[PDB]
Design a protein around this nucleic acid. Structure first.
Ligand SMILES: Nc1ccn([C@H]2CC[C@@H](COP(=O)(O)OP(=O)(O)OP(=O)(O)O)O2)c(=O)n1
Ligand SMILES: [Mg+2]
Ligand SMILES: [Mg+2]
Ligand code: NA
Length: 337
DNA sequence: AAAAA
DNA sequence: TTTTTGT
DNA sequence: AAAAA
């Protein structure tokens, strides 16, 4: 029996149902834009379950017993079985609102609210937005337009590794006992990503040392001329754009703009932070949903709390978090829900 | 949109 | 039916 | 702020 929870499924990058999931991902994205949160999440859960299947759906009998596939979703699957295409997803791909939202939000610093604003103003192209004399752009959007081609090309493994070296070299300069772990997609075995994410922790650093590290590391990069964009969120994390010199990559202008995210956590909470930052987003949502609805527990990136026992559960590894929740251990490369 | 309360 | 959906 | 991350 397949579980409705991603945290009770093993999802690798070997997708046998991309015909169905690409259509479901488009329908979900449209519902996000139309502020239909419920319908959006239902199409995301249906897409996630199909990604876990060890075989391709070739008939409607194949969908029997699979959870998260209600009547609406089964109609979409039936249509794709019929002629290899989704008429519903095709209509979304040709919709002017959907096309504008995809194009506008492809800019770093532009989300659903700004994309909706520009569409209602009558904008349809990035050229018309950038050249407009009345529009005022945030610092994030200015960086998003300036480094657009580099950021839209995404990041490969040689680039991510080159970035890992830069992060580790900078971090150990200020905290020599610090542990730096690449998280996100790359930890789950992905070949590419929209960014490179890292978790930093130190077993001997003080409360003040822990607080100052991200400021020290980003100032160091600013001094080198490598910091293209920086936003530090106090507890603690930062959203960056780094200048990655081609010579650093072991695989034009001679460099590439790379989106990098850094997270600093207290040593004793490192397992919770690693689990939260490894992802996928769907795996994390279902872990938290399972904890709440199935175990009466509260899970977040910092802790696990048992509401019945009225106690915080400690963990030195991800394996211990899974054991507390009563879940079989899912490896990082199996969390691609 | 699907599943549970 | 209403509520929940990653507080 | 709100928005974006
Ligand atoms: N809405 C989100 C977004 C992110 N995360 C967590 C898990 C993934 C980790 C990385 O965030 P992203 O870098 O956006 O996700 P990604 O899994 O690494 O995908 P990509 O490789 O394209 O960056 O943060 C999350 O829990 N919920
Ligand atoms: Mg990432
Ligand atoms: Mg990210
Ligand atoms: Na964006």
């Amino acid at each position: 029996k397949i579980s409705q929870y991603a945290c009770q499924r093993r999802t690798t990058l070997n997708n046998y149902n991309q015909l169905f999931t690409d259509a479901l991902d488009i329908l979900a994205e449209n519902d996000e834009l139309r502020e239909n949160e419920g319908s959006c999440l239902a199409f995301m859960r249906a897409s996630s379950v199909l990604k876990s299947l060890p075989f391709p759906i070739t008939s409607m009998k194949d969908t029997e017993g699979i959870p998260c596939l209600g009547d609406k979703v089964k109609s979409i699957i039936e249509g794709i079985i019929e002629d290899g295409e989704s008429s519903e997803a095709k209509a979304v791909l040709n919709d002017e609102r959907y096309k504008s939202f995809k194009l506008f939000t492809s800019v770093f610093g532009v989300g659903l609210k700004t994309a909706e604003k520009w569409f209602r103003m009558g904008f349809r192209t990035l050229s018309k937005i950038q050249s407009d004399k009345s529009l005022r752009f945030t610092q994030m959007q200015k960086a998003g337009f300036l480094y657009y081609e580099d950021l839209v090309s995404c990041v490969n493994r040689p680039e991510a590794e080159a970035v890992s070296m830069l992060v580790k070299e900078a971090v150990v300069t200020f905290l020599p006992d610090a542990l730096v772990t690449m998280t996100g997609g790359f930890r789950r075995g992905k070949m590419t990503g929209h960014d490179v994410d890292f978790l930093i922790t130190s077993p001997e650093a003080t409360e003040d040392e822990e607080q100052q590290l991200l400021h020290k590391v980003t100032d160091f990069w600013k001094q080198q001329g490598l910091l293209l964009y920086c936003d530090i969120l106090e507890s603690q994390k930062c959203f960056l754009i780094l200048k990655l010199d081609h010579g650093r990559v072991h695989s034009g202008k001679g460099w590439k703009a790379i989106r990098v995210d850094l997270v600093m956590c207290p040593y004793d909470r490192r397992a919770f932070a690693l689990l939260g930052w490894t992802g996928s987003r769907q795996f994390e949502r279902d872990l938290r949903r399972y904890a709440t609805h199935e175990r009466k527990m509260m899970l977040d990136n910092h802790a696990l709390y048992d509401r019945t026992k009225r106690v915080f559960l400690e963990a030195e590894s991800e394996e211990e978090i899974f054991a507390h929740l009563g879940l079989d251990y899912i490896e990082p490369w199996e969390r691609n829900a």
